[PDB]
């Protein structure tokens, strides 16, 4: 009775949102970007191969200096690489080897990791003793922690397998804000450039735009068919791209509140684990399960190129802040730098 | 180049420790412990977040990972166990109502693209409860599995001494339900190792060791092309 009434009201609201989106869909991104010249054949080649990890890499995050990157592999090691020289700056032994994510603080003083331990472990790289020690363990998530990104040295948004995202205060170790609303477990998060918002993709085939300070879900983006394993914010912050298991990458615009473009091909039947934009946002680099990374022209939905250099599943993909490089970690226990 | 040389020396020192830790990690055998709440998977070897059980058989250290503290949805976190030597699947063989749930879960694990290279050590637990359920006659497998009526005990069966034929037919039927799935897909890449175990069984650690030995031998032979 009451439940049926609420379900009918929810269906009416969903139809209202769908009709508003259809009314705002006068043209498509293909029509607008039809006259622009194609990017050509983007042929990136492996500049550096980082060969120190002895198990599958689950995630890699770049530092804001565009030189240092932290890599998380399921051997209990967080290796911080000097990507210019392939030097291992740090090798952090993890309490739980089942790490699924790693973050690199914009200041570079801290890194994060997490996974099946349900704990985001913050490691201080600038200790007075000269050795990296765990600074704070963030407990409170009741599922595997799938992604984490530092806003600063004291705040970090962590998305977990308990279908919730959490904003943490590292000094106190407490969830200052819990982001609820995803029915499926969240797999990735992408902080906006101004850090006032973040989009989270979950296994409910929906991506939700969250307000960090307010704590509510401002916009929910549907259109994917399967679990959204990857999410990445456009460099202007007005749009974002998702990667899913339905072998499609979809670009969602915040201010249009709907999907703009679908990046798929008929010969692609493998899910997308990682997505990342270039510095201009023109190239959408996406890692796939077919051991290859297809570079997508984000405005024209054309496969610009293929980053085929991994013998196992591509799990993570990261583009530097200056756009000079693309780091592609994978399950073959190697990270490759492409440009 | 003074600081550049120190960076390479630090990297070589770090890479040295990774090699040392990798050799230590290679001496450990990683196992995924899976099963329902009534499966009795916590009492197999008898030795928050993900729980780890460490047991050693014949100087070989096994790390059995029981993944508690997660939700009922496992399609994403089970991909973290792509490189485990074996998945230890424990089934409450006496609970007929959840046998199909165990079969569906086994079918998903067997056919998952990130678990199709992993042999499964199947434990058909609660054989003592299964024996007393069959002899009582109150609960019938044919109500939950109509093909059990047309099922005959295999000639390759090895009944325990003093075991009733109905109990032997029942437990081997449950084994063949999982073995039907295992033989239907995964051509020689991975194998199923079914074991009939009770709650008071003390040779499960040996059974895991014997199967893991078979898995690693087949993995080593597959690398050189022999298997």
């Amino acid at each position, epitope marked *: 009775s009451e439940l049926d009434q609420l379900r009918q009201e929810a269906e009416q609201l969903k139809n209202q949102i769908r009709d508003a989106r259809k009314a705002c869909a006068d043209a498509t991104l293909s029509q607008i970007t039809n006259n622009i010249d194609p990017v050509g054949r983007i042929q990136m080649r492996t500049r550096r191969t980082l060969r120190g990890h002895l198990a599958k890499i689950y995630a890699m995050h770049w530092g804001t200096d565009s030189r240092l990157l932290v890599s998380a592999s399921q051997d209990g090691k967080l290796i911080i690489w000097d990507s210019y020289t392939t030097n291992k700056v740090h090798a952090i032994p993890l309490r739980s080897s089942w790490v699924m994510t790693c973050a690199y603080a914009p200041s570079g003083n801290y890194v994060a990791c997490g996974g099946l331990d349900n704990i985001c472990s913050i490691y201080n790289l600038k200790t007075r003793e000269g050795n990296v020690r765990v600074s704070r363990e963030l407990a409170g998530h009741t599922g595997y922690l799938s992604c984490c990104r530092f806003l600063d040295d004291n705040q970090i948004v962590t998305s977990s397998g308990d279908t919730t995202c959490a904003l943490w205060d590292i000094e106190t170790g407490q969830q200052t804000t819990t982001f609820t609303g995803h029915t499926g477990d969240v797999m990735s998060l992408s902080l906006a450039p101004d850090t006032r918002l973040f989009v989270s993709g979950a*296994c409910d085939a929906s991506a939700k735009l969250w307000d960090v300070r307010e704590g509510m879900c401002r916009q929910t983006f549907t259109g994917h068919e*399967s679990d959204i394993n990857a999410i990445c914010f456009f460099p202007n912050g007005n749009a974002f791209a998702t990667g899913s298991d339905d072998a499609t990458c979809r670009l969602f615009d915040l201010r249009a509140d709907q999907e703009l473009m679908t990046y798929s091909h008929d010969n692609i039947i493998c899910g997308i684990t990682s997505v990342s934009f270039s510095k201009s946002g023109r190239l959408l680099l996406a890692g796939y399960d077919d051991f290859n990374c297809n570079v997508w022209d984000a405005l024209k939905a054309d496969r610009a190129g293929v980053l085929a250099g991994h013998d196992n599943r591509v799990s993570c993909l990261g583009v530097t802040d200056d756009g000079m490089a693309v780091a592609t970690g994978s399950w073959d226990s190697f990270l490759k730098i492409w440009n | 180049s003074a600081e550049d040389k120190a960076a390479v020396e630090r990297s070589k020192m770090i890479d040295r420790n990774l090699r040392e830790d990798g050799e230590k990690a290679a001496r450990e055998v990683k196992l995924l412990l899976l099963g329902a709440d009534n499966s009795g998977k916590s009492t197999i070897v008898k030795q928050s977040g993900i729980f780890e059980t460490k047991f050693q058989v014949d100087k070989v250290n096994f790390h059995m990972f029981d993944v508690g503290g997660q939700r009922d949805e496992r399609r994403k976190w089970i991909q973290c166990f792509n490189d485990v030597t074996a998945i230890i699947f424990v089934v409450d063989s006496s609970d007929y109502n959840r046998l199909q749930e165990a079969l*569906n879960l086994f079918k998903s694990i067997w056919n*998952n693209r990130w678990l199709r290279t992993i042999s499964v050590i199947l434990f058909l637990n609660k054989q003592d409860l299964l024996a007393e359920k069959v002899l009582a006659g109150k609960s019938k497998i044919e109500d939950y599995f109509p093909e059990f009526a047309r099922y005959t005990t295999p000639e390759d069966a090895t009944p325990e001494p003093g075991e009733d034929p109905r109990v032997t037919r029942a437990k081997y039927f449950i084994r063949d339900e999982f073995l039907r799935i295992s033989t239907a897909s995964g051509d020689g890449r991975h194998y199923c190792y079914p074991h009939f175990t009770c709650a008071v069984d003390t040779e499960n650690a040996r059974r895991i060791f014997n199967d893991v030995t078979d898995i690693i031998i087949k993995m080593n032979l597959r690398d050189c092309g022999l298997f």
Partner: nanobody
């Protein structure tokens, strides 16, 4: 927006017949294996049947073998379940569950409590 809409459930006499329909939208229906799951009163979620992407690989749970006939129409994006010879233990909320990933032989988590690609369900009541 992945949306599964069950229909056709209702009060049915024991031994009666009841055809369920699952209107599917928001995904390519022909790329996914489709599932039927139960919700008995006071009991956990029970998988009933699955049908493959093409419709060739069909498996039922043993309690409904010989009685239930799952079928799909990829052209109409509809998943069917012909429930003949209905018994009182079949009184449950029947959900059509879609397997999470396309082109996959494995079908994970369709019987989970908070599964996403599963409809709101229809109430099938088999009573005298």
């Amino acid at each position: 927006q992945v949306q599964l809409q069950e229909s056709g459930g209702g009060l049915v006499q024991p031994g009666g017949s009841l055809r369920l329909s699952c209107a599917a939208s928001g995904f390519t229906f022909s790329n996914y294996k489709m599932n039927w799951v139960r919700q008995a009163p006071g009991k956990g979620l029970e998988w009933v049947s699955d049908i493959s992407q093409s419709g060739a690989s069909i498996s039922y749970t043993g309690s409904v073998k010989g009685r239930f006939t799952i079928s799909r129409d990829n052209a109409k994006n509809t998943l069917y379940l012909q429930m003949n010879s209905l018994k009182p233990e079949d009184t449950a909320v029947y959900y059509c569950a879609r397997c999470p990933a396309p082109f996959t032989r494995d079908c994970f988590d369709v019987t989970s409590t908070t599964y996403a690609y599963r409809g709101q369900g229809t109430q099938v009541t088999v009573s005298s």
